[PDB]
Symmetry: D2
Subunit: 390 residues, 4 copies
């Protein structure tokens, strides 16, 4: 009565909707995404339409209520990210930006006029957006960004100058949610649209992680923004940090799908591939690896489930999320690399996919709070002493 | 709103009874057990009465229904083991034998007459019992034991010959649940009482793990047992293996309390102890360790909770238990050793307790299924191929 | 007086020639190789001429005496592989095949006529060769290959049928050293030249490890070979296994250069990159990583040195080599991945090179004896019991 | 031709004297020490005479030239510590204090009159000494000690006040080398003899690491010391730090013997113990562990050898020593704990010794520079930035 696929029966913890939604999306993902990832990753190609398709399914901004969004549960959101990542992290990352970094902040930090004007086209996937916070000289420490926003008392607008780098989707984005430091001192969020004079978004080359995903920069040469494009609901670092957490949530769930995919591939291979006369799966050294992969996946899953619930009850704290994101991203990296080892030579071929996952999770464990950073966050919360600096 | 003590709010997952019970026992444990462990461990002493006290609280065999037992939930059982281990593994191990290895098998594999005759005195703690399965030449492989049970057609009894070693409580036990291989081939369970001619239970010396716990052997020199002392409900290896799992459950929860105790001690020490002018807790190297300890504890807890539930629904499988026991025992070992490192020189003094825990969890990760064994169990269940032998 | 670059003074252990040679090659490597690896790796390109250049330097088959080879020391050989790998593993792998897998076997297992005819053009780099042993269904277990070699009593030749896969250089090779199982039972080595009817060497696509290196297969459709092309000095698995060890030697040294390159890049970056107002190198979490990288590199180096010496004294045993190859490849993998983490986002860009190394060492730890395999080899030698099968 | 006992042939790197000395001592150690460690450790007993015996062999202060000392090589010193630790770390620790912490500083920082007066009785083992630096509030940071030494212009002496804790041998010491902070600011070294009014050396209880070794404190209640008892050759923290390094050297070698002992015990046990019908040594999971133990031991050995040489050439730097001490102590801890796991239940019995080693190396990795501390030392030397504080 044991099911290595769902050891602790996560299924009897989901609601029939959550279940339907999961399955439904898994069908889109396997049928429409999987058949197009081998080359999308090999030749660094992001199929814009992918967003549009997700737009019809109504998977973009699924937790938001109204404005054409599903208004589904956090768990369902996690389940969704898990199916998407089971295919490719780059893909899930596009969806993540759109959902938690572009929509959610507009929805919770914007004026009603902003929401009305944008949320709908975002949900439909007519507007591909991006979250521009990171800078060449500001990564783990945002209180160090250089993008400044000056105010034109006369014209009723701000003028932004700065460079954002490593920004997902930026290259083929229509709406840009840029964060700059103002004259008052507080950093705010500005909404930018492509076509604005001064705004250019070159693409980054030589990526060897998240290749199926478009990544570029945001260069602003005196880009004039109207007052009505300022996010009226976020006067400081909490704007991005509030959203950031919503993103980390999706990531905690996500990486678990990539792990499960590596697990299932290794397990099969071990049964299918024979050496020394028998199937690899018959060796102790092979079984322990599978034992450990499954164990960490399971532990993560049920943790994620729990958090999903607490979230919907508005009882989720930033640190809780740091904990699962930090944990799940590290474990998912080992699992990938282990899987890669078990497939031997074949393992280094993208045609066996595992290599793609190892590579992708390399960035996932780096972005949205490096591994060690999340450790310090947890340590601050546990000891009460700050350990990020001197 | 983050509580490093209960990151994911395990509390809102417990029932008011489970909570009361927990607290209630924690009071007995802190008030009656803690003040007596420093020396009990230093001088290898097991305070028999400890059982009697637990007998009044009705903590022995808490899940059994009737026969004077609480008939409480599996979760409450786990919570109980967690509070006991938070003090000392040896202590929790005594309680574990009594509960899951002596009572549970009698209750589920005995005749009604056996239950009526024994369960009550066990629950009251008037009868200290022990589980004798392991032998000098049979540890991980029980299908290799040498204790044989011959049948006396004439006298209506069996004659047992064999040696069981490393048996918890045996030295001061009144009832012995011994498993021997019969003539039919199937191995059965025999009930032995002290005083039987032929039965001797010397004690083992030189233990440097689980010292506060009594450990001895079971030597049987033609010990004649009446037919009515044979466990009529277990015709083979499933008798011990069925019970074994119930024991592993308690252990999965247990080790988590020992970890939490090490965590809380290190955290404090790090805040209290200063070096280089500041509190140790101010260093990154110290914070990451605390970060990791807390993370593994939390993951385990919520997993254990889940299993506790599935158990009461009769949906718990042996492998599920192997998974948590294997996982939790390993993580709890690292956590101990880490804690020990963080207290520096003091860390090697039993007066700081951590050393005691590192030592104790050394046996916990070894007994009731070594770490690698549980790995093979999981691998068999995952690949479908046996990897214990050639 | 401490030099983090050479902690234990490996320098005062080298001979002035070994030193000259090292430096000399390091100049070719930095000047001629480094400036061409960013794209060679990005677009999977192997600059054939690279061999020719190494041919002029006389670095191909450096230990062989006569036939136009340097006849230098094993240490110098290791030093050479270390400088080459400091650039790219793919590059060093090309040189490795040529040296230890194509030349050495011809030199030690061939007739004089074979040596005279081939060694010279190989050393000059006029003949690019490859070692074909691995098969689609034979990887860790060679006693399972399917390439059969039948004998033509009439024509005085053999006919080979089989497929070799994952063969380095095969795509642009002139000489092929193929191993096939004969009718007698013993497996022998056959020399094949491009142009032979029946022999085709397609290339493998989708590599995401050792991209700057050409990898293809060896398909033989009744490829007729003259008796004079059979390696008269190797009647069984010891032919490849004898050479294999000579290859592993070079690899033990090699991976150490890739590690040092990752170390030097991280160290600099940590000093150059600032966050939170100071240089990353000022954080404890960053320093420990650097501490560990350096420690493992050093340990490996001096071990390699020692073995190099024992080798020249003909006192090197297969297991010694397994030990360093196994050890060094694993440690060099962690070091890469760590380095990659420390460079954050940039770390995922090939323009920062570390990513290339992590990827490359993924194959190095897989080929020429997987990590776990070398473990079993060591275990056999230590316990005297074979543990590869049932 | 492979010898798992000496993989890389360390033997052909030793001089016939070094070899004789090694063997000679190994005979004393096996014949006189081993038969007395089971109980010495069980009942916390230090056989004072042990020093006297080592005194006759002339093993105390072996590198010092003259004054009745051997004046042997650093390598021979390491070899000596390795044989001693192969028995018990506590034992080797006694010898270490005597040699590197009591004698060496007197010899290199004392006046000739001091050397003449003490070195001889120390070498003979007539004077058991101890190194008192650590304090209750000063462990990793010595620049924080509280023992002050005031000067009596009138009497020509100093008055010391302070407490030193965790001091090896102190309980049965005749000579005390105490370090206190003077009025000038510089910390100096004072020589104290038992019987001095004001000086008391109680013993510490509850040790569960290095039990066979005596450990106590040094309480000084206005202990008046003559000017002639001040170490004229050490005006600051470099006095202890200079000696400290000489101690770490011995430790780097030492822990390697304890590892080898655990390795040899596990290997045998694995061959001797059978489960599932065969010897444990026949399982892959068991072989990999042995593979890893041997690998780390070997790497350490040859590193230690090298350093030994550089030392005698006066080319050893503090960081080199930190590197091996840090490395070897950590690896020797894993090896112990692994060994302990492999012996299952028996493993928790001191009669199988491994448990004793795991426990002992717990303190070794803590004293003379914690693991993380040595990491920061290395990081300072590598980046040039101090990371011990804010
Ligand atoms: C595929 C990909 C897509 C991305 N998409 C986006 C996007 O859409 N929007 C956006 O805003 N950003 C994006 N980023 C960038 C990401 O948010 C930043 O990489 C991350 O917040 C910070 O790291 P960094 O690259 O600046 O490196 P750093 O901050 O310089 O850190 C480098 C290393 O130093 C360590 N470190 C840093 N500070 C400390 C400290 N105080 N103590 C100890 N260790 C420290 C880290 O743990 C890490 O190992 C993306 C990156 C990748 C790789
Ligand atoms: C404090 C303490 C109390 C105990 N109390 C009891 C009690 O009350 N009742 C009772 O019945 N027993 C008891 N035991 C013993 C316990 O149940 C046995 O130790 C355990 O089932 C088996 O291990 P073993 O000691 O026989 O060693 P082994 O079975 O010999 O195993 C030794 C090592 O070998 C490994 N190993 C074994 N087989 C294999 C394989 N096929 N493949 C790969 N690795 C393998 C293990 O992982 C372990 O590291 C106790 C032990 C301690 C230490
Ligand atoms: C870039 C690159 C270049 C190469 N170039 C060459 C070349 O020039 N010439 C040539 O002959 N070959 C070459 N190879 C292939 C290499 O020699 C083989 O990959 C290697 O010997 C065996 O692994 P495999 O790929 O067949 O996988 P497998 O043998 O199937 O092994 C797969 C996994 O199973 C494990 N495994 C296998 N058997 C056991 C067992 N009994 N017990 C426990 N675990 C086991 C391994 O540890 C590994 O993790 C190359 C590979 C790469 C990736
Ligand atoms: C059996 C035994 C014998 C001993 N014998 C002697 C003797 O003969 N003579 C003598 O002088 N001393 C002796 N000592 C003590 C030893 O020298 C000290 O334990 C050691 O120098 C320092 O640690 P501590 O105990 O004070 O703990 P601490 O210095 O308080 O350190 C505790 C923990 O904190 C960490 N830590 C400390 N500072 C930092 C920092 N800045 N950043 C990050 N982590 C940090 C450490 O890594 C360790 O894990 C002995 C100890 C034992 C256990
Ligand atoms: O780093 C960030 O600011 C968030 C990235 C979210 N994502 O999935 O790309
Ligand atoms: O090994 C066994 O058979 C069970 C031990 C249970 N316990 O807690 O001592
Ligand atoms: O696997 C092999 O047979 C050897 C590979 C050598 N190399 O460096 O590519
Ligand atoms: O910590 C110290 O000051 C040195 C200890 C040396 N030793 O072997 O006990």
């Amino acid at each position: 009565e044991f099911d290595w696929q769902d050891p602790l029966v996560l299924e009897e913890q989901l609601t029939t909707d959550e279940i339907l939604i999961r399955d439904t999306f898994r069908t889109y993902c396997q049928e429409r995404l999987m058949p197009r990832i081998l080359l999308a990753n090999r030749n660094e190609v992001f199929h814009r339409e992918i967003i549009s398709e997700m737009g019809e399914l109504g998977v973009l901004g699924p937790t938001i209520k109204g404005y054409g969004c599903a208004g589904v549960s956090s768990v369902a959101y996690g389940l969704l990210a898990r199916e998407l990542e089971r295919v490719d992290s780059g893909y899930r990352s596009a969806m993540s930006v759109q959902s938690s970094l572009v929509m959610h902040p507009i929805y919770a930090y914007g004026s009603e006029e902003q929401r009305q004007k944008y949320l709908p086209q975002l949900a439909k996937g007519e507007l591909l957006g991006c979250f521009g916070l990171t800078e060449p000289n500001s990564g783990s420490d945002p209180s160090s960004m250089e993008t400044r926003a000056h105010y034109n008392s006369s014209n009723k607008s701000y003028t932004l100058n700065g460079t954002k780098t490593w920004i997902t989707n930026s290259p083929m984005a229509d709406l840009f949610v840029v964060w700059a430091r103002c004259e008052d001192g507080c950093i705010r969020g500005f909404l930018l649209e492509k076509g604005m004079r001064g705004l250019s978004a070159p693409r980054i080359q030589g990526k060897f992680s998240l290749r199926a995903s478009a990544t570029g920069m945001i260069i602003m040469d005196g880009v004039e923004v109207p007052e009505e494009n300022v996010l009226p609901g976020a006067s400081s670092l909490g704007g991005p940090f509030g959203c950031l957490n919503n993103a980390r949530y999706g990531i905690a769930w996500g990486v678990l799908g990539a792990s499960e995919f590596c697990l299932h591939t290794a397990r099969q291979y071990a049964l299918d591939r024979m050496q020394f006369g028998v199937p690899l799966a018959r060796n102790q050294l092979i079984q322990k690896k599978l034992a450990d992969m499954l164990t960490e996946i399971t532990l993560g899953l049920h943790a994620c489930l729990q958090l999903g619930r607490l979230k919907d009850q508005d009882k989720a704290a930033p640190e809780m999320v740091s904990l699962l994101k930090r944990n799940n991203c590290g474990k998912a990296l080992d699992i990938a690399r282990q899987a890669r080892d078990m497939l031997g030579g074949n393992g280094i071929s993208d045609e066996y996919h595992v290599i793609r996952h190892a590579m992708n999770l390399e960035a996932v464990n780096t972005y949205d709070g490096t591994h060690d950073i999340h450790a310090l966050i947890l340590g601050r919360a546990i000891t009460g002493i700050q350990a990020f600096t001197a």
